[PDB]
């Protein structure tokens, strides 16, 4: 006779996110050739790692103006992708849709002052255990990097992702109050005649920024 099957009382509905390829209608249509086309990016975090975008600082600018005092602190921000300082970059705009990242966010600083004036800045990552640093002397201890301005102004830094969990959230849920990923800093450890000379900042992904569990959000 006919082949018997048992239609399961359950799991017959549309999951809305299930490898199912809907059945065929109006077939045998050969779309026009779209081969060898420029700017083709297979996946995201290949564009983010490669095309860095600016960060947002006070007054809606991408740069942090060098202050005239010899030792002062510049723009200090939480590390989580939802940080007002990254609210306008491609990296945060994309990591909005995903729930947890697992990678080193990469920062580019390039100096825009005249060749008249040199300046020497440092950036220091501070884990989430104790209050953030407030002076270069009290911040030299944590992971930091120092650099002088020169013919080449771009100085990258790879903000190390080190956390007690192999992944880490990208949306800081309202429950806690001091970000669990720790603060980064940017200090005027000394400058030359450059006062109000813009240091524009950039953000990017590192050699391993892996993103998983994509979710939705009203945005």
């Amino acid at each position, epitope marked *: 006779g006919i082949f018997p099957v048992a239609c399961s009382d359950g799991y017959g509905g549309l999951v809305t996110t299930d490898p199912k390829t809907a059945d065929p209608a109006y077939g045998k249509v050969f779309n026009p050739p779209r081969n060898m086309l420029p700017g083709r990016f297979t996946n995201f975090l290949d564009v983010a790692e490669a095309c860095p975008t600016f960060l947002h600082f006070e*007054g809606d600018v991408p740069y942090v103006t060098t*202050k*005239t005092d010899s030792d002062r602190v510049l723009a200090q921000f939480d590390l989580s992708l939802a940080a007002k300082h990254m609210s306008n970059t491609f990296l945060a705009g994309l990591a909005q849709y995903y729930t947890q990242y697992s990678g080193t966010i990469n920062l580019h600083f390039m100096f825009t002052g005249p060749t008249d004036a040199k300046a020497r800045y440092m950036i220091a990552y501070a884990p989430p255990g104790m209050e953030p640093p407030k*002076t270069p002397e009290a911040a030299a201890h944590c992971i930091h990097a120092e650099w002088d301005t020169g013919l080449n102004s771009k100085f990258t830094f790879s903000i190390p992702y080190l956390s007690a969990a192999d992944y880490a959230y990208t949306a800081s849920d309202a429950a806690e109050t001091t970000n669990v990923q720790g603060w980064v800093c940017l200090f005027q450890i000394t400058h030359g005649k450059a006062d109000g*000379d*813009a240091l524009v900042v950039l953000a990017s992904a590192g050699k391993d920024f892996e993103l998983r569990l994509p979710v939705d959000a009203r945005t």
Partner: antibody
Framework: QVQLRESGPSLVKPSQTLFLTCTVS????????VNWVRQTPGKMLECLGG???????GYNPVLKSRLRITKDNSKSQVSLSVSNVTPEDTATYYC???????????????????????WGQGLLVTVSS | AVLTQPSSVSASLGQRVSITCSGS????????ATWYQQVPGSGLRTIIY???RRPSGVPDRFSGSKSGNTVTLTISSLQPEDEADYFC??????????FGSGTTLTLL
């Protein structure tokens, strides 16, 4: 000559936004930054913040999240904003100029080689319920 | 106001007046404080910047120096035009300046 004229509202009801301005006159705002410092009735000074020649600026950390400073680089006037005023925000409000391109934060209040040489006459902001 | 100031001091003309401004390790010493002046009814002027210097336009009789965690304003000669409130202000490690109470200096 350089002078700073400040125009703003007085007598306003608490819990309301405050729109202060410091018409700058005598020099280009691009060459000298302006800082805002207030003086409560009697004798005190609580630095509010300032705006550098460049867009980047800074504010008082204890008074941040209720301060926003814009800059009309052509009209040459700089503006303040206070999100929600309380009966204690009443003070004498000044605008001041640093001698260097960037003096946006409260760091300009104490500096080794930079000062605030030009001060506006100051407006008295009164709020009460 | 979050610094130590010596109330209001007085003296007569052509007398030396020294007003000390005592802070804390974080607020003063790391960076020299500044000294203002406010005539009753008029706005703030800057008298010492960098804790030890003068702004051009201010006469030479104002002299400040910084020691340890306290600074001091020394008026080498007093005049009738130097009667006003004197505030000391200094940048604190908290990123917010801490201001003195004002040393009203009255001439006799």
């Amino acid at each position: 000559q350089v002078q700073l004229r400040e125009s703003g509202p007085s007598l306003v009801k608490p819990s309301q936004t405050l729109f202060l301005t410091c018409t700058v006159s005598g020099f280009s705002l691009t060459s000298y930054s302006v800082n805002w410092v207030r003086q409560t009735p009697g004798k005190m000074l609580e630095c509010l913040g300032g705006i550098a020649t460049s867009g980047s600026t800074g504010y008082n950390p204890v008074l941040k999240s209720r301060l926003r400073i814009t800059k009309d680089n052509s009209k040459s006037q700089v503006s303040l904003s206070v999100s929600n005023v309380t009966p204690e925000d009443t003070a004498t409000y000044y605008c001041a100029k640093w001698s260097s391109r960037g003096g946006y934060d409260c760091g300009v209040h104490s500096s080794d080689y930079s000062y605030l040489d030009a001060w506006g006459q100051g407006l008295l902001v009164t709020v009460s319920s | 106001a979050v610094l130590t100031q010596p109330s209001s001091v007085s003296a007569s003309l052509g007398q030396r007046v020294s007003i000390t401004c005592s802070g804390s390790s974080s607020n003063i010493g790391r960076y020299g404080a500044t000294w203002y002046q406010q005539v009753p009814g008029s706005g703030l002027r800057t008298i010492i910047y960098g804790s030890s210097r003068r702004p051009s336009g201010v006469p030479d009789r104002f002299s400040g120096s910084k020691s340890g965690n306290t600074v001091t304003l020394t008026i080498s000669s007093l005049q009738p035009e130097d009667e006003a409130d004197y505030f000391c202000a200094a940048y604190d490690i908290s990123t917010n300046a801490v201001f003195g109470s004002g040393t009203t200096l009255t001439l006799l």
